[PDB]
Design an enzyme around this catalytic site. Structure first.
Site, short mmCIF file in Angstrom:
data_model
loop_
_atom_site.label_atom_id
_atom_site.label_comp_id
_atom_site.label_asym_id
_atom_site.label_seq_id
_atom_site.Cartn_x
_atom_site.Cartn_y
_atom_site.Cartn_z
N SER A 47 5.94 21.79 -42.91
CA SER A 47 6.09 20.35 -42.72
C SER A 47 5.20 19.54 -43.66
O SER A 47 5.43 18.34 -43.81
CB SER A 47 5.79 19.97 -41.27
OG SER A 47 6.79 20.48 -40.40
N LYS A 50 6.82 17.30 -46.19
CA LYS A 50 7.37 16.00 -45.84
C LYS A 50 6.76 14.88 -46.69
O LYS A 50 7.32 13.79 -46.78
CB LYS A 50 7.16 15.72 -44.35
CG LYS A 50 8.18 16.40 -43.45
CD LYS A 50 7.92 16.14 -41.98
CE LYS A 50 8.98 16.79 -41.10
NZ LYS A 50 8.89 18.28 -41.11
N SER A 95 6.70 15.06 -37.16
CA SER A 95 7.23 16.16 -37.95
C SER A 95 8.68 16.47 -37.56
O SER A 95 9.03 17.61 -37.24
CB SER A 95 6.35 17.41 -37.82
OG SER A 95 5.06 17.17 -38.34
N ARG A 227 -6.33 23.05 -36.15
CA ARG A 227 -6.21 22.57 -37.53
C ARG A 227 -7.10 21.36 -37.76
O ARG A 227 -7.82 21.28 -38.75
CB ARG A 227 -4.75 22.25 -37.84
CG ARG A 227 -3.80 23.43 -37.67
CD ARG A 227 -2.35 22.99 -37.70
NE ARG A 227 -2.01 22.13 -36.57
CZ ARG A 227 -0.84 21.53 -36.40
NH1 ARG A 227 0.13 21.68 -37.30
NH2 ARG A 227 -0.63 20.77 -35.34
#
Ligand SMILES: O=C(O)c1cccc(-c2ccncc2)c1
Ligand SMILES: O=C(O)c1cccc(-c2ccncc2)c1
Ligand SMILES: [Cl-]
Lengths: 242, 242
Positions: A47, A50, A95, A227
């Protein structure tokens, strides 16, 4: 140049996971990481793609502006937030894969390839489905290459209009307060091994900008919150944020 | 269309203060305030004028972009953050009057006057000193008038470049998280009675936009923090933010 700090590994081991964090001090033109090897290991962008996808869609007219509505197609998917109308801001926030898959289809195999070469993005290999190559195709990109790409975007130096780059930078807005601003994008690669999670962007300060790009092994979705958590603890150690 | 909700006064009284909060629901095109009279009473814009001031400076080339550095003139002033180099972002973040006074001087009375009329901004009266009329000149604006201006800025409908408006909205960035984004500008008027503090802007949500404009009596600088606290206490009450 670059420079390695094995001490950040304590943050990964504290959470029984392992990965890499890569920082870039724009003022001093210096980079820092806990693992120079993995910092240059190219993975599927997932993702995080993007960002360039948004840039291309906007610059070609596939997306008019950040307010254009892209209606839900009616297919119930395992992610609830995907089953509703979206605009560029919300699509990037959540996302929403199917929205960008429609972007890629209208973009076209040829135009996508040409633009990613102009971006000097990863290996520039879009082999696979035009609407999923960034998830299970042949495209690969490392953390250091993300920073290089992200830097061009910050300075509006990518080969698209300034408008397109401003809009995407607006859509990347994740967090902001009196101390810092974060413009970044998450990623979650699950279709092909190794399963990993991404987070790439930068921290804006009053007098400096810290670009970052991290990936970590993500065998199951429970650890996605790490993350940002691990990234921030590295930022706090480096005294970039309180 | 407009409705008065005197319940919000509880938020002012528990802080031993007085003022007005004005909300506008963009989707429903409905407005809410605690004091219809004061919502339409015109005060000095003070540092809220840095929105139109930035828009004019950008559109004329006085300010090249959000990265142009404006050098401290070497004069020590009582505000520490002002004795510093600034760009549009930090200048607006820290309400650096000296930087914007030079903008107005370079803009000029004629062009400044012409533009504020195009914007339909306040009473459009720049009477006074070009480098301080928004602090002790003749210009005046009400809370409801601020919203009518803010709304035109959000939709890029003001009579300046799209780029200029996008830049200012970036500079207005104040707070952001997973639930909302706030783009606003504070104000503190002290040279002409009554002493007040401003806070005008809007709250971006996934599916809507809430414009707001508040001013309150500010007899001393000790209560400047209530501008944001009171506003947020109303937003929570109306369940606009968690
Ligand atoms: O973090 C991402 O970028 C991302 C993208 C798509 C799906 C998911 C996901 C999948 C399962 N449970 C929770 C979240 C995450
Ligand atoms: O809050 C603002 O927008 C603002 C603008 C200019 C000056 C001051 C100020 C003046 C004296 N003591 C403290 C702060 C505040
Ligand atoms: Cl922004």
């Amino acid at each position: 140049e670059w420079q390695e700090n094995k001490s950040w590994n304590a943050h990964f081991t504290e959470h029984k996971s392992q990965g890499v964090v890569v920082l870039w001090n724009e003022n001093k033109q210096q980079g820092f990481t806990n693992n120079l090897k993995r910092a240059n290991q190219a993975f599927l962008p997932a993702s995080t793609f993007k960002i360039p996808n948004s840039l291309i869609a906007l610059d070609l007219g596939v997306v008019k502006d950040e307010h254009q509505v892209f209606k839900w197609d009616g297919q119930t998917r395992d992610i609830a937030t995907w089953n509703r109308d979206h605009n560029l801001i919300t699509a990037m926030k959540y996302s929403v894969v199917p929205v960008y898959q429609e972007f890629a289809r209208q973009i076209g195999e040829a135009r996508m390839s040409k633009m990613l070469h102009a971006f000097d993005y990863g290996n520039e290999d879009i082999s696979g489905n035009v609407d999923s190559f960034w998830l299970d195709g042949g495209i690969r990109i490392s953390a250091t290459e993300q920073i290089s790409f992200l830097r061009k975007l910050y300075h509006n130096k990518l080969h698209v209009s300034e408008r397109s780059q401003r809009i995407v930078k607006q859509a990347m807005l994740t967090e902001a307060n009196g101390d810092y601003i974060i413009r970044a994008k998450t990623g979650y690669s699950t279709r092909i091994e190794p399963k990993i999670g991404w987070w790439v962007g930068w921290v804006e300060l009053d007098d400096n900008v810290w670009f970052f790009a991290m990936n970590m092994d993500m065998p199951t979705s429970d650890g996605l919150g790490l993350r940002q958590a691990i990234t921030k603890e590295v930022l706090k150690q480096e005294k970039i944020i309180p």
